[PDB]
C-alpha cells in the first residue's frame, strides 16, 4: 500500500476544498466555508499497478506565504496549485505559491489547475497561461462543478511518481455488502423518512 503526501495550495475561494470534497464523496459543495490551517483528507485510487493513496493536505488560502507554513510542505511528494479562471488576481498569485513551495520541496511534480471553467465570463484564457512553461509544471482546465478533467491532476501525478506513462485507473474491488436482517423495533419509523424524501424534489441540473 503506497502513500503520497500531496499539498493542495492556492488563493481563497478558488475551489481547493470543493475539489477534494467531490473526490471523496461525489457531492458538489456550493457553500463557501473557509478552511482554517490545514485539513488532511485521504483519497485512494486503483491502478493497473495496484491501489495507491494520496494524503491530500488542503491548506488555507488566507495565510501569507512564509516560513510559518513550512510544516505543510516538509516531506511533500507532489502538489497542486489552484486558481480561479474568473479572477485575474487569483492567477497573478500563482508565482507566489509556486516558490514558497519549491523553496522547501525543490524538484517535485506540480500541476497547475484553472478552476471554474464552467463559468461564462472567463478572464484568464487558456492561451494566456504560460507559467507552466517557465516552471516545468503540468496545466489543466478543470471544473469541480461539471467535473471537466476533474481526474487528470491525480492521474498525471501518479504517472510521474510511479514512473509509468501509461498507468490508468481501474475498476475497484466490489466487496460484498453486510447481512441486513432485523425488523422488530427497527421497522416502522423508517417510512417516516422515506416520504420526507419522495417529496423533496431533486436539483434539476441535467
Amino acid at each position: 500500500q503506497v502513500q503520497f503526501k500531496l499539498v493542495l495550495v492556492g488563493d481563497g475561494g478558488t475551489g481547493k476544498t470543493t475539489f477534494v470534497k467531490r473526490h471523496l464523496t461525489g457531492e458538489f459543495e456550493k457553500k463557501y466555508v473557509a478552511t482554517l490551517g490545514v485539513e488532511v483528507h485521504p483519497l485512494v485510487f486503483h491502478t493497473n499497478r495496484g491501489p495507491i493513496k494520496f494524503n491530500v493536505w488542503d491548506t488555507a488560502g488566507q495565510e501569507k506565504f512564509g516560513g510559518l507554513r513550512d510544516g505543510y510542505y516538509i516531506q511533500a511528494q507532489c502538489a497542486i496549485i489552484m486558481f480561479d479562471v474568473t479572477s485575474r488576481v487569483t492567477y497573478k498569485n500563482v508565482p507566489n505559491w509556486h516558490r514558497d513551495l519549491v523553496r522547501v520541496c525543490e524538484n517535485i511534480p506540480i500541476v497547475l489547475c484553472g478552476n471554474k471553467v464552467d463559468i461564462k465570463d472567463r478572464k484568464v484564457k487558456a492561451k494566456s497561461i504560460v507559467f507552466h512553461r517557465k516552471k516545468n509544471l503540468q496545466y489543466y482546465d478543470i471544473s469541480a462543478k461539471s467535473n471537466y478533467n476533474f481526474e487528470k491532476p491525480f492521474l498525471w501525478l501518479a504517472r510521474k511518481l510511479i514512473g509509468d506513462p501509461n498507468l490508468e485507473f481501474v475498476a475497484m474491488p466490489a466487496l460484498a455488502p453486510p447481512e441486513v436482517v432485523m425488523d422488530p423495533a427497527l421497522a416502522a419509523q423508517y417510512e417516516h423518512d422515506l416520504e420526507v424524501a419522495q417529496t423533496t424534489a431533486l436539483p434539476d441540473e441535467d
Binding site: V2, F4, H23, T25, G26, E27, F28, F45, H46, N48, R49, G50, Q77, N107, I108, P109, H132, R133, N136, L137, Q138, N147, F150, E151, K160, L161, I162, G163, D164, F169, V170, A171, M172, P173, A174, L175, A176, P177, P178, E179, V180, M182, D183, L186, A187, Y190, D193, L194, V196, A197, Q198, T199, T200, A201, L202, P203, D206
Partner: protein
C-alpha cells in the same frame, strides 16, 4: 512544459486486480445519476453521489442480488448494497425518471452505513426498464428465504 521529466519515487510491478464481480450475473446495466440524501445536517438536501452505470447482480453460488454503481473516469464505487424483500422504488415528487428508496447498509465506503438514495435516468422509459427489473429481482429475493 511539453512534458516535465522526473525520476520515479517507487517501483510497482504490473498487477491483476479482480472486480470481485466474476462469480457475477448482471441482470441489468444502465447509465444514471445517483443522489445521497441530507444527513445530520438538519437541512434536508439531495447531494450528488455519482454518475455512471447502475447494475443489478445475482450470485450464482447463492441467490443474493445487489445494486452496484461506479463513477465515470474515477471508477470508484458509489453504491453497493443487497436488495432486500422490503425494498421498492417510490417515485420522487414530480419527475418521471426518478426513483427513491432506502437501504439499511450501503457499503460504498466499505463501511456499513444506512442510506436514503435516489437515482435518475435519461428517459422515463428507462426509469421503467430499471424499475421493472428491480421489482422482479426484489420478488425473486422475497421468495428465496422460506
Amino acid at each position: 512544459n511539453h512534458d516535465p521529466q522526473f525520476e520515479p519515487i517507487v517501483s510497482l510491478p504490473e498487477q491483476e486486480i479482480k472486480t470481485l464481480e466474476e462469480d457475477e450475473e448482471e441482470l441489468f446495466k444502465m447509465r444514471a445519476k445517483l443522489f445521497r440524501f441530507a444527513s445530520e445536517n438538519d437541512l434536508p438536501e439531495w447531494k450528488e453521489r455519482g454518475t455512471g452505470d447502475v447494475k443489478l447482480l445475482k450470485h450464482k453460488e447463492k441467490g443474493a442480488i445487489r445494486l452496484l454503481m461506479r463513477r465515470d473516469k474515477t471508477l470508484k464505487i458509489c453504491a453497493n448494497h443487497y436488495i432486500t424483500p422490503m425494498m421498492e422504488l417510490k417515485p420522487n415528487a414530480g419527475s418521471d425518471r426518478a426513483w427513491v428508496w432506502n437501504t439499511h447498509a450501503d457499503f460504498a465506503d466499505e463501511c456499513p452505513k444506512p442510506e436514503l438514495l435516489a437515482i435518475r435516468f435519461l428517459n422515463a422509459e428507462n426509469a421503467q426498464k430499471f424499475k421493472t427489473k428491480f421489482e422482479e429481482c426484489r420478488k425473486e429475493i422475497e421468495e428465496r428465504e422460506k
